[PDB]
Amino acid sequence: YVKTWFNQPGRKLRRRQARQTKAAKIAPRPVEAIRPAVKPPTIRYNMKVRAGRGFTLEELKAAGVSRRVASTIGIPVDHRRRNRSEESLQRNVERIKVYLAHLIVFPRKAGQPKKG
């Protein structure tokens, strides 16, 4: 079998139309969730900083965001990752704190019974 790439420009267009389709549904919030900053796990790459999967629970507790609130305002949680050093904790705590500064959370209507 020989795989051909004639749909390469048609996949590019289809993926872009999905981003536009996604943005139409969720109008003002970002098309991606904020990702942490981590360091790759080798002696070849540990100097580089890249994006992680989600923020650790210890990073969210320091930033002031609970693990149940976090998912609702676009902050992924990684229950697996941990902070073995204070630099990873502070690098990503500041990342969450900056995110909260630039964030507008629209209020939600709440059911409110008469008494009690």
Partner: protein, 49 residues
């Protein structure tokens, strides 16, 4: 007696482990040189511009 295969894979990996930083430093040093190797303005070039 000579070496063991436990470190042989570690030595070759440590050899290519510096490939990333060597490429990063080579790219970084090149841009510094290009910043220094800028031909002057030749003020007779904005005469009509």
């Amino acid at each position: 007696t000579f070496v063991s295969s436990t470190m042989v894979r570690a030595a070759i990996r440590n050899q290519a482990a510096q490939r990333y930083v060597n490429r990063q430093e080579s790219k970084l040093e090149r841009q510094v040189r290009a910043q220094q190797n800028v031909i002057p303005e030749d003020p007779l070039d904005n005469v009509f511009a």
